[PDB]
Subunit: 481 residues, 3 copies
């Protein structure tokens, strides 16, 4: 008596299918990465720039609270934290701030340099009194490290004129401010001239600022305001500053080097000496799976983020220790006793064997099925959040509509692919067992009684020799009938 049957094991792997959920299967692959090291890591060997208690504004202006960032020159990405609260210390408006954050997100390294050396650039103006209790440091009134708040020298503020020629071979980021006093008494005290102007021109930047005197609510005990400005000076170009008051002059500028794959993320994780190909605000990922459910914000080469809790793909068959009627059908159960293949035979004679041809073709096909569908899935490169000022609610909502829309498409695509192809993987195995069985019934013909549960009760007695004949596809029906 020869029987035909399929594999069973001690596996608890569950997948879901179109017709049935919580289907226990013999073998499966996880497609969804849910593990991370909970740390900030280097990316391709380059550590990120950690702004800590500072935000982008405080770093680029040189807020005294951020002095430890002053020597930073190259990074792989930028990390803000939940306590990145130090930006502008003196009240005002940072014009096109979010655009500057976008500019700095593709900066891989920069050279901070003294664009107008303090001790020699301003002989006719005071360079020593531009400090405020709003930018305190070490118990004293102080000021930004990258700006120089010029004031009158000996009751005079002559027309100032200073130029810089960009000989760096790179774009130079130039920052300045215009100070808006709270009274004309303050205007006279700081700059002498009551009717001031500031002009900033380059070959592609051209703005004139007229300071406004006004009574304002005090912010950090300050009724004045500084508006902060920035521009990118192209290589070879000149930028010209002219003023008779109220100029918060550039002191340090940045020659920028552009790179690929950087971005600004907000994380509470701590920096460790790890190296990763993929970084999230939650931690680093080490995986080749096509999907992750850890965070939508990613730095590097990452799996696509999806809103799923499980994405298990069946590769083996139903674990029983059907569209084609064999598995869980007329062959009621599986054989844990057969460990060496997915499909096989069981011989019971006087004197368990798995079929290698059918099992190796199934193994080949399922491997191509897993590989071919993961291939259609593409690596997620750097994708981060974006910031918008309080008059850009429509754009902010448009950006959120775009990100949520794609995330819903990819989550639907992923969950539905697995659900529908899991059911086709079980039908594939059921088909393989039904084809192996029928190939044995066309080989024995009249020489055996079909019991109907995958077994052929032999009428004659042939020992092991002809039993391998049945399996090998070399069984001689005439000799025994």
């Amino acid at each position: 008596t020869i029987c035909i049957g399929y594999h069973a094991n001690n596996s608890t792997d569950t997948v879901d299918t179109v017709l049935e959920k919580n289907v226990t299967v013999t073998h499966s692959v996880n497609l969804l990465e849910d593990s991370h090291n909970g740390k900030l890591c280097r990316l391709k060997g380059i550590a990120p720039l950690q702004l800590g208690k500072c935000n982008i504004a405080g770093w680029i202006l040189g807020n005294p609270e951020c002095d430890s960032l002053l020597p930073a020159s190259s990074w792989s990405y930028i990390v803000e934290t939940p306590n990145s609260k130090n930006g502008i210390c003196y009240p005002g408006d940072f014009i096109d701030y979010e655009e500057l954050r976008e500019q700095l997100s593709s900066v891989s390294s920069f050279e901070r340099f003294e664009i107008f050396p303090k001790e020699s650039s301003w002989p006719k103006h005071s360079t020593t009194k531009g400090v405020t209790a709003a930018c305190s440091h070490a118990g004293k009134s102080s000021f930004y490290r990258n700006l120089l708040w010029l004031t009158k020298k000996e009751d005079s503020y002559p027309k100032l004129s200073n130029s810089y020629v960009n000989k760096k071979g790179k774009e130079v980021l130039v920052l300045w401010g215009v100070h808006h006093p709270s009274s004309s008494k303050e205007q006279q005290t700081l700059y002498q001239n009551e009717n001031a102007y500031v002009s900033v021109v380059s070959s592609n930047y051209n703005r004139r600022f007229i300071p406004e005197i006004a009574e304002r609510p005090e912010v950090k005990d300050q009724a004045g305001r500084i508006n902060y400005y920035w521009t990118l000076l192209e290589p070879g170009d000149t930028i010209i500053f002219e003023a008779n008051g109220n100029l918060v002059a550039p002191w340090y500028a940045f020659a920028l080097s552009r790179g690929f794959g950087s971005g600004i993320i907000t994380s509470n994780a701590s920096m460790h000496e790890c190296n990763t190909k993929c970084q999230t605000p939650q931690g680093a990922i080490n995986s080749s799976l096509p999907f992750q459910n850890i965070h939508p914000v990613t730095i590097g080469e990452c799996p696509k983020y999806v809103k799923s809790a499980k994405l298990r793909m069946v590769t083996g068959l139903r674990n029983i220790p059907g569209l084609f009627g064999a598995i869980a059908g007329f062959i009621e159960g599986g054989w844990t006793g057969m460990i060496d293949g997915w499909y096989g035979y069981h011989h019971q004679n006087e004197q368990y064997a798995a079929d290698q041809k059918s099992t190796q073709n199934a193994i080949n096909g399922i491997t191509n099925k897993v590989n071919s569908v993961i291939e259609k899935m593409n690596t997620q490169f750097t994708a981060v959040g974006k910031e918008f000022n309080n008059l850009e609610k429509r754009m902010e909502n448009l950006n959120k509509k775009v990100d949520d829309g794609f995330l819903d498409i990819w989550t639907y695509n992923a969950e539905l692919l697995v659900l529908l192809e899991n059911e086709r993987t079980l039908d594939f195995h059921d088909s393989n067992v039904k084809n192996l069985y029928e190939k044995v019934k066309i080989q024995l013909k009249n020489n055996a009684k079909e019991i109907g549960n995958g077994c052929f009760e032999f009428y004659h007695k042939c020992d092991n020799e002809c039993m391998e004949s049945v399996r090998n596809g070399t069984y001689d029906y005439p000799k025994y009938s």
Copy 2:
């Protein structure tokens, strides 16, 4: 003679499959909601705010045509109509109007309050002559209810300085205007001083305005212009207004409560005393279907909008009153006489029965298949159109490219899924019938003749026919 066959009924339900269109099937479910009550309803018990003939500007400024909106304090969504034509009655520019619309789209309730009480805040200026024929009410010249057009008092306009401290614990929306007269005679008549300014400053707002005198084409017979401005004053912050002319001063402001799920829609439907979980400009939807084709604009929890006319999913089989060769194959037709199941047996002996095991496993799987794909579809929360001014065409087109891209993908996903899985569901039934038949062929073996159309050498009564549903040797 015992036969194996499948169910048929008087159903005309049609589906489309990958290999054949217009396939009549025994049972199906519609996945596409196309019905609505044609009314505006409450959402979670809260009525919408109906602006009627007014648009957002006329309402929030207090255009005299909108007096009936003045007491409105809480709403679930905002309805403009095709006749929402009353906005600014005196001509000019409403600066960052579309942004204000976006801001108000997330307001669930507000408190309208007098930020500068008219009779006590302006002792040195006139509060009684700032009316215009462009904002007529009751046959007389009038003005906005939330603005106060100050003018000179006794031939002088002293420098004015007024401040408001937000003690409301909420953002306060403050609106004001700057008037730009058409001539210097008009400037002197209204404000005396020829060179005027308006300054409005807070802790995070800081703007100064110089009125501009120019000859302009008349709009509503007005050659002057008013620029309307707004800002959100944070809790605890102070806003200071300073001017020596041309100030349309704030009179009423709004303490705002933010909420989730609101929006502004344009509808011609009328309000009724219904409550709904889902509202569109055409009418409210009461459905659990994953899709609708009624409107892309939705308020609440709604089915996903798709551009399809039909999304019917086959649950039963082909209606005959195959991949596996049985249904519409060697079993050429179905049995209307069998009413109690999808697959069953028919006996003709000397002395119709549905199989419960095979039919209930088909029902269990088909139920899971419909439920499993409807879960993959997630409810649509509030999604409404947006507005852009005439220098934001690129942004407007980008918004339209985004909205169109998503709808083309979803319409494709839904239409293709139903098309492919319909063929797949009918194959499932063909497999169940071919598996039912083969289970019988191996039980009867040589004791019966297989006619080959799904259909006894001995004479076997009713008792033994249920045996199969069979001790072959015992009754051989």
Copy 3:
């Protein structure tokens, strides 16, 4: 020794497709879904030629930059072509305010009429109209200027308050351009416009802007320390625009009455114009295809297949070519019959004296015809989709626009490549099914009268001639 056999088609095809279980599967018949061929040329759309800006860009064309004189008599087009040499824009340095928006507005203009809105010869009697030239806009070795603007200057040391209005009686929206000049010095301001403090005012019923010229020492661009800010507005039909100035006005000279169409746009291409008509135009060349997908270029004009990032989308229709789930094809029926030319599934007889089965074969064609059609319909054609432009303070919006384009393209490429992978398996299964059903159809007829070898052949236990073979194939046995 009389045998009917059941088989399937074979031919000499090298057509190859990919399947979810196997790659490089050679099939008998397949259809390409992916247009990769174009003519390499720019062509008319609906018989209307594009506007080739050539060495000029939108700014230089619309202002009338003298390098662009040859575009002046162009009145209608089907789309606008910039080239990689489209570098002539503003010739006098300055800022073209809201330029990208203006490009976006012209993308929808099908034709326009250029006309003297303020005729030079008669609109400015109290001002000079002949001295507003510069070496920055050189023409023919001489100082010249934009063809559509007029640089008004002082007349005999008098530049009086100027005021001119235009009432749009054209029935279409009118595009009006002007400039405001910002001189380098206080002397330049007096030398050109006399009055020290000047202003420009431009008001319509929906437009109200004022300009105050700013004098500042500036780096020279094209030998000019001054700057001009260029401006534009659309005057609605019946609306009136009014210019008032006391200097610094670069006045509108020619304006444009626009006709809006559908489906135009601006593309960058380096292909040459050729005398051809096309429903579909891309920067690389024109497409003539009914296929649903193309991989030529994402920019298109007209009605085009949808762009995907794919190198091959071939969809099997015929059979596995051998000269499955169901066990017949490449199963117990091991190989195919090149000798059965007129059908997908048929019979072979060995009598004493190949045949296609019409019924099962013509049903499989109808099914396969319907599958490929049903899939092509779900795909919709690409209407005009073009790139957008953004100035240097719109980097976030530029990226957001790219995240959108990149997002959709990835999704449609995934959709097309997964649809063909998965449905190619289903089609091969379908063919293994049709063969098996036919082979079991024959088996149930013969029952006891024939021995089943198991390779699709039935050796009939009686004698069976050409008449009895037709019985088996006809089903009349």
